[PDB]
Amino acid sequence: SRKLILFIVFLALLLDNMLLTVVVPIIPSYLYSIKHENVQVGLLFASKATVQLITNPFIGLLTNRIGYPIPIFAGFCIMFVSTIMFAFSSSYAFLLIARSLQGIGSSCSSVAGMGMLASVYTDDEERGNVMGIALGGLAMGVLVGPPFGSVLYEFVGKTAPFLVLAALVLLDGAIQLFVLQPSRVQPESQKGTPLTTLLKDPYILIAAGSICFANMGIAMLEPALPIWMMETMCSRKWQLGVAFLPASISYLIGTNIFGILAHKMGRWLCALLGMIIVGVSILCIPFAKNIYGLIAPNFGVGFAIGMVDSSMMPIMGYLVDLRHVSVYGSVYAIADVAFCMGYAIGPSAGGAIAKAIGFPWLMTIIGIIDILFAPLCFFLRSPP
Ligand SMILES: NCCc1c[nH]cn1
Numbered sequence: 001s002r003k004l005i006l007f008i009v010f011l012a013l014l015l016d017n018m019l020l021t022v023v024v025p026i027i028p029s030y031l032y033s034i035k036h037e038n039v040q041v042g043l044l045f046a047s048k049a050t051v052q053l054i055t056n057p058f059i060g061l062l063t064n065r066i067g068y069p070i071p072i073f074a075g076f077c078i079m080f081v082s083t084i085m086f087a088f089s090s091s092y093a094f095l096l097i098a099r100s101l102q103g104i105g106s107s108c109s110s111v112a113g114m115g116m117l118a119s120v121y122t123d124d125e126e127r128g129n130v131m132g133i134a135l136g137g138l139a140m141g142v143l144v145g146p147p148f149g150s151v152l153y154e155f156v157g158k159t160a161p162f163l164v165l166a167a168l169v170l171l172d173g174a175i176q177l178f179v180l181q182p183s184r185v186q187p188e189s190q191k192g193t194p195l196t197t198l199l200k201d202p203y204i205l206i207a208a209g210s211i212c213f214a215n216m217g218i219a220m221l222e223p224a225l226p227i228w229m230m231e232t233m234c235s236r237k238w239q240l241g242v243a244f245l246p247a248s249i250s251y252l253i254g255t256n257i258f259g260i261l262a263h264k265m266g267r268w269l270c271a272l273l274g275m276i277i278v279g280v281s282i283l284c285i286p287f288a289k290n291i292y293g294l295i296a297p298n299f300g301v302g303f304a305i306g307m308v309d310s311s312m313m314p315i316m317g318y319l320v321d322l323r324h325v326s327v328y329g330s331v332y333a334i335a336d337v338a339f340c341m342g343y344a345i346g347p348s349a350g351g352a353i354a355k356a357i358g359f360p361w362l363m364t365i366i367g368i369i370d371i372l373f374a375p376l377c378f379f380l381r382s383p384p
Contacts, residue, residue: 002120002121004175004179005116005117005120005179005180006117006130006133006134007175008072008113008172008175008176008179008180009109009113009114009116009117009134009137010133010134010137011137011172011175012072012075012076012079012109012113012137012172013109013110013113013134013135013137013138013141014137014138014140014141015079015141015165015168015169015172016079016102016105016106016109016110016138016141017137017138017139017140017141017142017145018141018144018145018148018165018168019079019082019083019086019102019145019165020048020102020106020141020142020145021141021142021145021146021149022145022146022148022149022161022162022165023086023099023102024045024146025146025149025150025153026149026153026158026161027044027095028041030090030158031092031095034090034092040092042347042348043096044092044095044096044099045347046344046345046347046348047096047099047100047103048099048100048102048103048106049103049340049343049344050103050340050344051099051100051103051104051107052103052104052106052107052110052336052340053336053337053340053341053344055103055104055107055108056107056111056333056334056336056337056340057195057330057333057337059071059107059108059111059112059329059333060111060115060192060195060329060330060331060332060333060334061192061195061329061330062329063111063112063115063188063329064187064188064191064192064327064329064330065187065188066185066186066187067185067186067187067188068112068113068115068116068119068329069116069180069181069182070182070185071108071111071112072108072109072112072113072116072176072180072182073173073176073177073180073182074105074108075104075105075106075107075108075109075112076105076109076169076172076173076176077105077173078101078102078104078105078108079101079102079105079106079109079169080166080169080170080173081101082098082099082101082102082105083162083165083166083169084162084166085097085098085101086098086102086162087159087162087163087166088159107333107336110332110336111329111332111333111336112329113134114131114134114313114328114332114335114336115327115328115329115332117130117131117134118131118317118328118332119326119328122326124263124314124318125263127314127317127318128259128260128262128263128267128310128311128313128314129259129260130259131259131310131313131314132255132256132257132258132259132260132310133256133259135255135259135306135309135310135313136252136255136256136259139248139251139252139255139256139306140252142248142251143248143249143252148161149161152164188327190325190327191325191327192325192327192329192330193320193324193325193327193330194330195330195333195334197324198320198324198330198331198334199334201319201323201324202379203319203323203379203380204316204319204320204331204334206376206377206379206380207271207312207315207316207319207335207380208316208334208335208337208338209338209373209376210271210275210308210312210373210376210377211308211309211312211313211335211338211339212338212339212341212342213275213342213369213370213373214274214275214278214304214305214308214309214370215305215309215338215339215341215342215343216341216342216346216366217278217279217282217301217305217342217366217367217370218247218278218301218302218305218342219342219343219346219347219350220342220346220347220349220350220353220362220366221282221285221301221350221363221366222244222247222346222347223346223347223350223351224347224350224351224354224359224362225243225244225285226240226243227351227354227359228286228354228359229243231359233289233290233291235290235291239291242291243291243294243298244298246295246296246298246299246302247298247299247301247302248302249299249302250298250299250300250301250302250303250306251302251303251305251306252302252306253303253306254302254303254304254305254306254307254310255306255309255310256306258270258306258307258310258311259310262307262310262311262314263314266381267311267312267314267315267318267380268311268315268377268378268379268380268381269381270307270308270310270311271307271308271311271312271315271377271380272374272375272377272378273304273307274304274305274306274307274308274311275304275308275370275371275373275374275377276304276370276371276374277300277303277304277307278300278301278304278305278308278370279366279367279368279369279370279371279374280300280367280371281296281297281298281299281300281301281304281367282297282301282363282366282367282370283363283364283367283368284297284300285297285298285301285363286359286360286363286364312335313332313335315380316328316331316332316334316335317331317332319331350362353365
């Protein structure tokens, strides 16, 4: 019964994304009051991604030395401490510390869980099938985070969503202790194909670049779209809120269906078509005149990014087996670094560009870049 390991990675990713999305509404409002009674706010937002990017390679190396369960449980402990600090700390410095620890725990959870899922699901088809579910864990977390945080903030109080998240994290830790049992440190058999050799690989680089650009598109789109909506359409707050909902719904459906549909169609073809579709949707976003015009391109963006992720993570695992030794911590650290590359410089660079040139020009540039990179996914196809 290795399904319990899938549940642990699903719960870990889901709770991580719940915390990440509950935090985004609550933190600016709380700060916009203590200061009374641009640089630092962006630093607080990007600290999680920056620290996760920094500590991904170290966790990738550590998983080879001490196995996966100890990093997974450590990621749990760090996440629980970060949740408690979010609950009870009300200073900006402590908020930054909590964000940095959340990033460290996110790195541990993501890298170790993806490596463990790759190692226990050695089959090519089942690897993608379960990684679709694991990736849909993040989509479910993103979907059910903001409403959960909002209702628990409005009805009970500020610390209630964080306390409930901490209780759910404690239950996740109890089941982790029951199934993983990190009683002792165990090493893996062989070495790990040092990162210097993995990054020289053109195919691993192509997969990481496709993931990075597909995620950077949405990472620049998500914070820079509401500003342009207020500039042009003068939409209401709730319209600014439900505009990106189709992207999340479509990402969930696309991930959960293409985790299985990518093997029969071809993972390279799925990534190529995903890049083309996300580029086309990003190009067509600026032409929408109202929310009803933005309903479909956001769906396309989310669907295509789901295809890209669900086809490219199993490509990373397959490439490490095909050309290197079968150790996955380092390669999935590479993939996580590719994700946080978009997640870190996404908002700031996107805003800077949208200030220098118009928002439609930024969207056009992102779309043409994605479409131009799409042919590069052809080289990922198997020789036969
Ligand atoms: N690691 C986050 C993957 C993702 C979800 N949505 C967009 N990208």
